[PDB]
Every structure is written in C-alpha cells, then in structure tokens.
Write an enzyme that holds these catalytic residues in place. Structure first.
Site, PDB file in Angstrom:
ATOM      1  N   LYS C 293       0.437   8.620  -5.019  1.00 25.97           N
ATOM      2  CA  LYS C 293       1.679   7.989  -4.590  1.00 25.97           C
ATOM      3  C   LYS C 293       2.563   9.028  -3.911  1.00 25.97           C
ATOM      4  CE  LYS C 293       1.407   4.542  -8.305  1.00 25.97           C
ATOM      5  NZ  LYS C 293       1.193   3.280  -7.532  1.00 25.97           N
ATOM      6  N   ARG C 370      -6.790  -3.502 -11.519  1.00 27.58           N
ATOM      7  CA  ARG C 370      -7.904  -4.419 -11.283  1.00 27.58           C
ATOM      8  C   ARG C 370      -9.098  -4.024 -12.141  1.00 27.58           C
ATOM      9  NH1 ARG C 370      -7.191  -5.247  -5.775  1.00 27.58           N
ATOM     10  NH2 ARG C 370      -4.948  -5.227  -5.318  1.00 27.58           N
TER      11      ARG C 370
END
Ligand code: ZN
Ligand code: ZN
Ligand code: ZN
Ligand code: ZN
Ligand code: ZN
Ligand code: ZN
Lengths: 518, 519, 509, 53
Positions: C293, C370
C-alpha cells in the site's frame, strides 16, 4: 503577413541576426611544412599521444621563433598530459620582444577522433577564447583529420563561439570581444582551404536554425515565422509561396487545419523552392514539423516531466529545413530542384480547439480519429506529405521532433530515421557521416499496423496499446505517401542541448549534405 | 436549418444519420416448429441446449423435412459436438432436391433460463457466422425455451450487432458487406411470438439511432448539430418540438445550465420534444437526458491517468437514449399518454469565458450553488432541466445520465443504477428493466451525506468535499431540484460504452420505452 | 498460544476491559403520563417541531414549580429544534437543590432515522463530557418505536464510553420518560448486551497490530469463550497444513505470527431448526504484501482494522453467548493472519491450492481477504449448516458505491439476503443489497490455474470478489457483507464495531 | 485486396470437389486470418471437413 497581438507590447517579428561576428573573421590556412609564425595573439596546438593513454606532450611542428621554441621544449612540457579536453595557457616574449600567448588542447590517445571527441576539444578551445579580448587565434593541427572532420572543427568552433544575445536587455555582455583573425597550420593545407567557407555557410545555416528555435513562442509564432522564411527567400532569391487558411481549406488539409483551430495565429504553409539552372536531375521535398508552440491541446502537457516549458522547440524540424534553405541558396548546387516545406501552426487550448475523439479528413480523403491532441505533429505532417507528393518529386524527407520515445530508444545524441525505401535510407545514413550529425536506422514494424485500425474512421491517429510511439507514428505517416521514396528523421531527442540550455540546430548540415552529394 | 458555427470551412455542420439501414429491408418470417423445418437456401442454424451436464452433447430435436438432411443430423452423427455456450459448427450437404444447403448450430449451455447476457453471447456467435459470408437468408431454429420478452431481445440484439456503422469511413469501406434479405425463425407457439417482430425492429433502430448519435464525435455532434438532429427527428415523426436558445434560457434564469456552457463556441440549446396521444390523457411523463456533447472537464481538466478524455464524446448518451426513446414512442404511438423529451445540451470546455471552480451560480429555482469542481457539470445542467420538468406538471420525472465514474466501481459495465424519491416509480423502472432486458439496479439516496453539501456561502454545494460515493451524493444534489413529483435518476456512466467492441451500447432506449408502455 | 517477540518490550496480550463504567449505571424507564420529576442531576428533553428549525415547545408535565416556570413557552421560544442543537441551564429546584435542565433539537421529521438518532445522542454525550453529574434523565417528547429506543440506549452507551487502555467521572443513575413505558422496559438490558458486544469489537479493532496479532487475538477469543462457556477449538499451522488450506496459509507465510483459526461454537437446548456459520475477515494488519500500500490514499496507517469482520463476529459471539437464544446452532469462524513483506512472503503470480482442491493464480497480494475467506468458506460448508454469513472489510471500492454509512450484502440466496436486510432494519445498522453480476465471471478465468484471484480489467471489484468467494460455496445459503467502508469512523478517529448488533439480530430472528 | 477465395488444386473426392467449385468459394474473401470450415461427407459416406485460411 501582419502578426496579431493581444497587447501593443506583443512582438510582431522574430529578431534575426544575419551578419554575425563570425562572418568578420578572416581565416587563413597555412601549410605546416614551413613552420608556424608566432607573432601575435594566442597560438593553440592540438596535440595527441597515440598509444599512451594520458601520455605526455611533445610538439612536432617547427616554430619560427627562437624564444618560443625554447618554451616548447619537451622538458618544459613534461608536466602536461594529453587528456582529451584538457588545455593550458602560456605567456612569453618572442624574438621581437613582443608578448605572445601560447597553449595546447588535449586530443587523447586515439588517432580517429569521434564527432563527440572533436566537440570536446572545440569546447575547450572556445573556453580559452571566451573571457579573453585577444585579436588573433592560431590553431596548429598536430592530429590527423580528414576534410569532413576539419570542416566540422570550424563549423563547431563558429557555432559554440557565437553568443545569442538577441533577448538580452539589461544583461548584455559589455566587453566580450570576438577575435578578428583565425590562422590554421595543417598538412596539405592547400587541400583544406576549399572547406573554410563551406564551414562558414554551414555554421550560419545551423546558427540561423538555432535562432528560430531559441526564439520563444510569443516572438516565433506561425505568422512571424512564415514572415522570416519569405525574407530569407528574398535575400537568397528563391521562389517562395505562403499558403493561408483560405488556400488550405481549398486543398482540404483537414488534419493540418484541425491542429491550428485553437490558436490566435492563422495557419501558414511555407513553400520555398530552389531550382538549379540547366538540366534538373533530382527533385526533392524536405518537410519540417513547424509547431511554434506545443501545449498538447486538451491533452494538456501537465504530466510530471512533460516539459511543457520547452515546447517552443516543436518547430525544430521547420528550422532545420529553413537552415538547409540558406545553405542550398548560398552554395547554389547544380542539377537539383529542392522544395522546402513546412505546415506551420500552434497547438493551443481554446473553445475553438479540436478535441480528443474528433474525426477529421486529410487532404487525401482519409478520415482520421483523433485519440490524443498532443499527437498533433503527425496530423500536420500527413497533409504536408500529401502536398509534397503532389509536386512529383523523387525523394520526400521529413524531419520532426515527433516522439519523446526517442529519449528512451536513442537518447540525446543520435537521431532516428524511418523509411519506406532502402536506397533513400542509405543516402540519409551516408549524409549523417559526412555531416557528422549522428543518425541510426530504426524499423517500421508492420505488425503494429493493426492497432491503428479505427472502429469508425479510416485510421486512428494513435495506437491505443502499442507503446513504441516512434514506430507507430512512422506507420501513420507512411499511409500518406503512396508511391514515392520517403524517409522520416525523428529529432525529438537530439534537438535541444540540455547541458548547454540552447538548441543544436540539428539537421541543417545533414539535410544539406544529403542534397549536395546525391 | 439552424446554422452551426465553424472555425474552418471544413468543420462539419451536421450529424450524418442513416434512417434506412440494411436491417430495415430484411423480411422476417416466423414459423411454428411443430410441422417441420424446411432447409432452403442460405444458412440454417439450430439453437440447442443440454440441461444438466456442461459441455454436453448436441442432439437435434425438431423435425426436418428432408431425408438427406435428416440422415446428416442423426443423433449418432451429432454426438461429436458439444453445446458449450457460444460454440458453433458449419455443415454442408445436398438435400432431397440434389441441391447444396448449409446448416449449423450454436450452443446455448446447460442452464434452463438464459439471461440477457447469455442471449448476447449466443447472438454474437450468430453474427460471426453472418460476417465474411455472402448469405441471402438466415434461418434460426429455437430448440430452447424463451419467453416473449427474451425472444424480442434476441431479434433486437441480432439486428443491432449485425449492423455496421460506416458513416465516417471514406477510403476504408468494407467492399464485402452484404446483408441478408430474409430471416426465418422456427419456434414453438410461433403465433404468440409473431407480434414481437415489428416491435423488435422498432426497438433496434431506436437503440441504433442513439448509438449513431453517441458515436458521432464532438465536432460532428455538437450542441447545435445535435439539437438540429432532434428537430429533424421530431419532423419525421410529427412530434411537437421547441428548441430553447440562450435568450429564453436567460429569461428562464437557468444559471446552472448556462454556466457550464459559458466556455463553448456552440451556444447552449435546450431540446423539448413532445408526444401527446389523441385519447384522454391519463399519465404525463417527462424524460430528461444529460446532453454534454463533449466533457473536457472544464478548468478541472481531465488530465489524470485513466480519465479517458478521448471518450468524452459520450457524455451525451442520456440525451441520445431519450431521443432514441422518442423515436420508438413516436413510431409505436401509445394511446393514453403525454410524453415530454428534454435535454439541456451544451459543451464543457476551457476558455477565457469558462466558469471557474469556486464560482457561485444561481439555478432557475433561485437556489445558489458553489461550484467545487467544473467536471461535475452534469448535475448542474440536470438541476435546471429538472426545474423546467416539474413546471410542466407531469406524473413522473425520469432522468438518464452518464453522471458519475464511480458507477464503474459499484455496478460495473453491465448494470445501471437507479435512484429516486419514490418507491412506486422505482418499481416501474425495475419492472421495465425486466421486460426490456436492460439491467438496472436500485441504489439508495443516503440522506446522511446531505450535510456535506452545506455550502458556507451559497445555498448548496455542487459537490461533497468529504464523501467519496459520488453517485449517491449527486443524487442528493439533484433531489434538491424536484419538490413535489415522483422522480427517478438512472446513472449509465458505466454501462453506456462497450469497451470490448469499441462502440456505444445505446443503453436506455428500450428501458425507457418499456416504462412508457407500462401499466 | 505464546506470542513471539522481537524485543522484550513487545506486548504479549490485548488489554481488554470487561467491566466498563457503563455496566455500573442503574436505569429505570418511567411513563410520561405520570409527570416529570426533577430531583437530581441534569434533565434533558428531546423535542422536535413538525412543519417549521422551529422553536422549542415543552409538552411534558414537570413536577417542580421552579423548573416549570423556567421551561415556559415564552422562555423556550429563544431556542430552536435544529437537529443536534441544544441548550442547558443550571438552577435551584423546587426543594432548593441545584438541578440542570436543557433540550436537544430533534429536527422536524417524525420518523427519526438511525443517522438522525446518532446526531441526537452525540449532542447528549457532549453535555455529559463537560459536566460532573451522577444522574441523567431523558424525557422523550418524540415518537420512537421499541427498536429505536434500544438503539438510542446502545449508541448512547457506546459514544459515552471512552477507550483509555493505551493512555499512560461517569454517571451512576439514568432515567427515561416515554409513553407506554412498559413496552420499553424489555429493551434496557438488551441495550447493555448490544453496547458491550460492539464496544468489545471496538476494543479489538482499535487494538494496534503489535498488541493485536494472530496469536494475541485468538487467545482473546479463547478467554472470551471461557468467560461465556462457549465451545472453542483453535487450529494451528500443523492442523491447517493437514487440512490443505493453501490460500489462507499463503497469505501468512510472510508474518512473524503463525496463522490461527478460531471456531467458537454455540448450541442451544431446544429443537435446532437452523444452523448458521458466521465468518469474519481477520487480517490483523494488511501491509498489502508485495503489492504494498504505497499509493497515495492507500491509508496503510489504518490497516489494523482489516480484522473488523472478525471483531464483529466475536462481538456477536459475546451477545449470543450472553443472551443464549433458543433453537439455533451458530459457528463463529475466522481465519486470522497477517499480510507482511518478507523473504518468506508469497508473491504476485504465485499459484496456490485451496482446501477444496481449486488452484488460484494470485494477481495482487493486497487482495488477501478473498483467499483467507475462501478456505474459511470451505471449512464452514463442511460443518453442514443452513446459512453461511461472512463479514469483511474486503474491497476499497465500497467507499465509491455505498460510502461510509451503508454496508454491502451479496449472496447466492434471496431468502437469506432478505433475512439479513430485515436484521438491518431492527438492529438499525444500515445495509444495502448489491448484485452478483455473473457476466463478469469470465474475467476470473485464469490462463494457468483454475481461477484468478482478481480481475485485471473489471473495476467493480466488490462484485468480482463476490464472484470469487461464491465459487467456494457449493450448495449452502451464503451472504457476504462488505464493511470496508462503514467499519471505521473517520470523523471520530475510532472504530464503529459495525456488524455486531446486525449479526446478533440475525440469529435471534 | 480482400479478394474472393479461389482454390486451385484438384482434390480426389467428387463431393469435396463440388464443394470447392469456384462459385462456392466466392462467398469468402482472403483477408489475412479469415477462415471458415464445413463438415460434409466424402464419396464414401464418411465424415470429413474442408476449409481455408
Ligand atoms: Zn505534441
Ligand atoms: Zn508536438
Ligand atoms: Zn464531467
Ligand atoms: Zn460529465
Ligand atoms: Zn488487503
Ligand atoms: Zn485486506
């Protein structure tokens, strides 16, 4: 013909300096076999040590002065090496009890000096010449150079010595004086005299092109630049013709006109012709990108590193062509007819600008889907190419600061050339070597043609996926030359000397050498 | 004709519009599959599925009226091909009359009820067999189950995808394009599906029309030329039309709509087409479509990577949808309805005359607005276009707009979002979605974000300074410009352009028409 | 369950405060039809003005003459009912004791929304945080149903509670006046359970990634189960390896804290009509992995909340484990781990095998949820349940769809979705139904593995993730709540504990 | 350019020969990459497939 202004202070003409200090330099070439007189001014030796890298200095020529000969004894020079670009100054009195300045510039250990090597030496010389108010310079060649290399020495000397003060007001250099005499001692000197004035012409053709480039966009705009070409054509007694918006519409140059819709200066198409007397054996069209300022249009140059503040130089190709027109006009070659062309305009942001996504029609009927308004150069060039081919010419050579991608493929020193004809590409390369302006042949990869297949128009202006921009643009341009040998030189990378913060006038010599030796 | 300004004499002065397309000349016949399939000239294609097992084998069920063609389509001979959605095979043979025929199939998977997305893929495979083959007739045999609405969708989608738009081709025309002249269809209970043939043809062109408008680039399709386009359309359809120019717009005090256009070289033009049925009028409807002929962003220029400024000729897809609707309505002629088609057309550009970020402007309802970002110009024009809409006194106001790029991050490229102030109206829109087979999905107007529109100086902020859910905040903004009328708002920013095929979808024309012919 | 350390100063546990000043407040709710009594503390009236931002008019009957003459219409005309605005004065009461009286504007709408309630409460808490009192009395001069009254209590408790665990005066009695007061007495104790359930989640979320890691968080779950007599089983790496949870393990290889999976289970004594599995994303810190990030707005400094769905589940376990609803079996699941950058990390392009055999081409290590949820979903369906409901801070896209107030629910079952939606109405935790558009499934068709972890083209990432998670439920009613946008309160700089009351209401209903 | 398809070679099958008649291949052009292929039966009632690129 009349330059529009927003306020009465906006300039209505490009200031051009025609008679330069360089032009008042009497040049003499003497044969080195008879010794060099060291009577006045500064006397510089060009010294090599074949083999020994960084080796010692040892003068080879006879000096016709006992005092100076003593100073130049090998024992006295032992402390100086021959490192390329190094230089030293000497002061002594001659047999006539007269003060004289002597020196040398290092030419390395390699015998074959590269173009980039000669420049390093010339820059070192000019350094000794600057901030020095002496009246004569003498250069003694103790290195071997062919006729083309020697001329390159003079061209580069003249160009680097000249200082463009056209735009200085409160900050003009007061006591910067130019030498008035240049002496050259060299073996077989008789053979090199032929090159002296040829160097002088080439220099100014290059310095001319540099003047037009360096001039900012408010001074050098489509109207004022086209005015300068006519004045040049009149001083050279060349046939000239300037197409305006009315004639451009009638020729249906939709692509070139679209780029200029948003400018306050009307489009102007420059067409100069030089025709030899007698039988004409070669007809040539030279085409130059003439964007007096490239803002990018609605695709504005606001991305980091897009260098919008430099885009006064997007007419470098146009400048190189006019520079070539000076050389050809002066030297008056035989048996050729040369057309100098350039579709001049300014790429701006306005309510009248063309938009990304627009579909315009070129003068050959082909519809073009605009994908990016900062790909404007190939739009102007497509119509210029259709115009050139209508003249019934043997070679079309266009030169343009087209794609920044050249910074990533060849860098700042070598231009790239693309073409549809090997012979023509070959001649362009040959001309690169005798002009000493480096060019490298890059391919037009046909596999990429499909990405220019527009969904609605006849062609896309830009490929959506291919990043090899310089090759894609050449694919686009080639669709506008139907049956003539055409080459394309991308000088976007080599045009501006970032180190020196000034143009190079790149292309003038190369294009003139191409025309002369055909 | 109302004159379009030009910079050079080559600037186009009109939108090229084809009304007589090759699809209008194809004769459609529908046959009942009971009683046999005959194998005439051209290509004959079976739509076959195999419930249960995926990639299952293809078996030809319907009765063919030819011994040779029957023997060739024997189940034992067809097992070598599966029914994977999209697959297709071409066959060649001689018939009972010693004549060569061509047949084939297209696989429709193993699912029972195909969705519009699945139908889209089956049709795409059909079109592939139509291209690069000089055929005079295509015949499709329905060995699959589809209701009347999905069967119409098949015809329209076939027609739309079959059509190739060559308006802007000059030296690169496909000199090989040959459309079929006849189209046979074999289906069970054929008499019930027959009524959909003419509506499908109407629905096709209505959508293809909006498509032509959208794909027309901003120099061809600008505020003047597009309003001229609508005038002609009203004229061909005997629709009432009034085109409001700058002078009236100033009289009407449309300061938000006018500001967005201050920087264009084409004056603002406000489209107002009207269809009034001859019977007693029971419902009055106003459809409003965002009409930005090119959205550079204004001084908030679209310069950020991925801003797709080169796509912004499509910021008038809503206006195109609404005009496409007007074609359908004008052609079909619903009996007891009054329909107003509105669009505040302009162009968002950079100039010395453009409105600036920070500018405070006054909407035609007297509310002042602080411009926080000039690239959110749609909600400004729609605000005034909505005020004008309520003044007409209708029952429903429905606007359709490529409003927020957030749409690509919420519902994507397939489903549009519907917002509104009225559950019943939102249900009618959702109902019309099912019957049109144009997917819409209801999204909330979250009132908690209203406070972030509280301008310190004007009456209201144009944009939220903190909330990132642009598609909702704009809905809150628009809702402040409809005071007492059922109103829904359909954001098609994500679904309007078909990136894969590089062409517009015409999305919304059929959705809006179905809504118009709703109970 | 020994927490590894780098230096001896590293914390080895989550400080968890179980006995809050809230739990020591005695509350009784009185009927407004019997007159208002102003004996002690501060008295606040919740008043609105239908129609007209209008003036405050006090309707209730106050039992002190002195306070009555102060709240006269003529005296209250100088104050308006703008939602949130408020005023309070100090005075001597009937019996010459210092009382304090004031109002809080409830706007002009009759149906006060959850968002409107939150505003009213914050006006209250602001008054309490600037005054030393021992009793608060709230007079309800507005209409709120039973569920909204509780919500008022809960959010009052939450906002009133301030978390001081990491730093190196409350009231003791609360009075409530409302019409038909008997109908509301039921909700008082429920509010306490709902308060702490969410404030408990808030404690775990606010816990930074050095205090709250996979070891110290799973430990905290065990301690919770033991204080609530829940059945617990924690799977370690060796168990996870034998169970072949490659996707969940992949995400953890780069951490200095080993993966730990939480199972906390609850069974009731009655007839079992519905078994429900609750799954929650538990990434104790999301560096993004090698897809770091680093982009502006990435908000890496906030990534200690990527375990908010886990905190929600554990907060739901407390509530369930406390109230002990009948006729339900609920499994509380969470594959907790940490997504870090190391020589031992998994890389983009890595192909991994989920516990159901499906190979997964990893496209972006920052979409780790996920993957951990994929193996956790395979687990859940193996327990044989009726409903699988997972809750995660899954996709940043949520901030552009629904924003910071409403969460997204996706699922393969309309009946289950509707129960979720109903539960949002009674918990007053806003939730909106979004579609699982199947037309995008093809973007997940990996060229080399069975399935892509991410689409490289579709920007509707929340739907794409849903498409990916659904491939790991083969035949069970399953909903998926994406709370990435609603879970953190940016204005307040604290967590919301979003999803606890919502999920508790689901199990009861 | 984009001309029609014409097959030159002679094949050893009356059925396939019929299929490759010039009048049949005209329907197809030679645009680079374009292809079609048909399933048919040979002179001996066995399944074959002929096409072009
Ligand atoms: Zn450019
Ligand atoms: Zn340029
Ligand atoms: Zn915009
Ligand atoms: Zn827009
Ligand atoms: Zn992540
Ligand atoms: Zn995460």
């Amino acid at each position: 013909s009349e330059v529009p202004q927003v306020v009465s202070l906006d300039p209505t003409s490009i200031p051009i300096e025609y008679n330069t200090p360089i032009h008042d330099i009497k040049v003499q070439v003497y044969d080195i076999k008879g010794g060099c007189n060291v009577e006045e001014g500064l006397t510089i030796f060009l010294v090599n040590n074949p083999g020994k890298e960084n080796g010692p200095v040892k003068i080879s020529s006879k000096v016709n002065d006992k005092q100076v000969s003593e100073f130049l004894k090998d024992e006295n020079m032992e402390k100086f090496n021959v490192k390329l670009g190094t230089s030293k100054h000497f002061y002594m009195f001659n047999d006539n009890k007269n003060s004289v300045a002597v020196g040398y510039v290092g030419c390395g250990s390699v015998a074959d000096l590269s173009e980039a090597d000669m420049k390093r030496v010339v820059l070192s010389l000019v350094t000794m010449l600057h901030d020095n108010k002496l009246s004569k310079l003498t250069v003694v060649f103790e290195i071997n150079v062919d006729k083309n290399l020697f001329r390159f020495f003079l061209e580069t000397l003249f160009y680097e010595y000249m200082t463009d003060e056209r735009f200085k007001s409160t900050d003009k250099n007061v006591n910067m004086e130019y030498i008035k005499h240049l002496g050259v001692y060299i073996n077989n000197a008789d053979t090199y005299k032929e090159e002296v004035e040829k160097a002088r012409v080439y220099y100014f053709g290059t310095y001319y092109a540099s003047q037009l480039i360096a001039a900012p966009s408010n001074y050098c705009n489509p109207v004022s630049l086209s005015n300068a070409a006519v004045e040049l054509a009149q001083k050279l007694n060349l046939e000239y013709k300037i197409l305006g918006v009315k004639e451009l519409e009638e020729l249906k140059m939709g692509a070139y006109l679209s780029v200029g819709k948003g400018s306050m200066y009307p489009n102007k198409f420059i067409h100069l012709t030089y025709k030899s007397k007698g039988d004409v054996k070669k007809k040539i069209a030279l085409v130059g990108k003439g964007i007096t300022f490239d803002s990018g249009g609605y695709n504005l140059k606001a991305a980091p590193g897009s260098m919008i503040d430099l885009m006064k130089f997007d007419m470098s190709g146009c400048a190189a062509v006019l520079g070539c027109a000076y050389c050809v006009g002066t030297l008056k070659p035989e048996n050729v007819e040369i057309h100098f062309l350039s579709a001049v305009c300014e790429n701006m942001v306005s309510k009248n600008s063309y938009r990304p996504g627009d579909i315009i029609t070129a003068s050959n009927g082909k519809t073009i889907e605009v994908g990016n308004t900062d790909a404007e150069g190939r739009l102007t060039l497509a119509d210029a190419l259709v115009y050139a081919e209508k003249l019934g010419v043997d070679y079309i050579v266009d030169i343009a600061t087209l794609t920044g991608a050249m910074l990533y493929s060849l860098g700042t020193s070598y231009a790239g050339v693309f073409g549809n004809n090997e012979e023509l590409i070959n001649k362009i390369l040959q001309s690169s070597k005798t002009s000493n302006e480096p060019v490298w042949w890059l391919p037009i990869i046909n596999e990429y043609r499909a990405t220019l297949n527009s969904k609605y128009a006849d062609i896309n202006q830009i490929s959506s996926s291919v990043k090899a921009s310089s090759i894609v643009a050449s694919l686009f341009l080639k669709e506008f030359v139907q049956n003539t040998a055409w080459a394309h030189i991308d000088i976007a990378g080599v045009s501006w000397n970032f180190k020196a913060r000034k143009p190079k006038g790149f292309g003038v010599r190369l294009l003139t050498e191409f025309v002369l030796n055909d």
